[PDB]
Amino acid sequence: MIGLVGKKVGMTRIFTEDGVSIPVTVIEVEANRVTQVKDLANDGYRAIQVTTGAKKANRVTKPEAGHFAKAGVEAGRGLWEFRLAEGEEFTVGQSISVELFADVKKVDVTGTSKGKGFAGTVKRWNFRTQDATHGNSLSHRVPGSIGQNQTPGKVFKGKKMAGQMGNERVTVQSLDVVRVDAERNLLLVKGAVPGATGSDLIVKPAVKA
């Protein structure tokens, strides 16, 4: 089934009547407007493309402005589309609310993780550091050996080395949905989700049922 696009809004905890406190991530899921519906006849697959939020009138380009005007949908920030499960249908211009998550229990949240920049092997791949004393010289956090000898004669592809860490989309799956608030457009999910505050997130029902 289709997901929804929301914005991460900090974190909080919910106190239950029995005493236990549930850490919850707050996701602001306002109305999602369908801008385009894809069908097997034309696109070879069925999907719905949705938009959310708002954009400055002078900031949206003409190609994007015409695309929204065709669907009669107010311009929003970015576009995302979700594949259909063959059991439901949608129409252009339809608005989708967070209420569809009322009957679900597990969700999958996808977002861009925080960017750590160029990271070393110790931080990136949990490499073990070498001794800080006992004669060690300029080799306290160095990766160490990266190959065997002449017989391979090369470093194998996929070697773990320092490089860019974070700033890629990652998915946290099977997260418990704690509360849904349609009128206030909130979705409380137990746990933590990728990305920093204000980052766009995609929420869909858990697939590992």
């Binding site: 905890r13 106190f15 005493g19 236990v20 406190s21």
Partner: protein
């Protein structure tokens, strides 16, 4: 957070006063023992008249930790020292007759009934 080579006090009156943890049981490559995990210890100094002598290896259960324990609502319990209770290596069965100091309720595993009963508090 009890790991190998850690000093522990003895809550019971078995005659031991200070013990060394030499192994954390319950899993391969386990790092440190929790609130109520079984550990293997060696006695470093005990009462001469006690039933347990120095330099003997026997199991033990942690009852108090300096690091503390976490409650489901976010509360924590912390102590000024680490304490344990002695065992029999074949059946858990704390050999002590009385245990001093508070004991947390995390040990209620349908089994440590003897420990909790002897506990002056909780």
């Amino acid at each position: 957070m009890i790991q190998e080579q850690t000093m522990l006090n003895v809550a019971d009156n078995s005659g031991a006063r200070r013990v060394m943890c030499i192994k954390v049981l319950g899993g391969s490559h386990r790092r440190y023992a929790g609130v109520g995990d079984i550990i293997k210890i060696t006695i470093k100094e005990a009462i001469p008249r006690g039933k347990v002598k120095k330099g003997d290896v026997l199991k033990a259960v942690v009852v108090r930790t300096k690091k503390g324990v976490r409650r489901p609502d976010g509360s924590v319990i912390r102590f000024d020292g680490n304490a344990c209770v002695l065992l029999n290596n074949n059946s858990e069965q704390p050999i002590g007759t009385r245990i001093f100091g508070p004991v947390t309720r995390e040990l209620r595993s349908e089994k440590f009934m003897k420990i909790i009963s002897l506990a002056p508090e909780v």
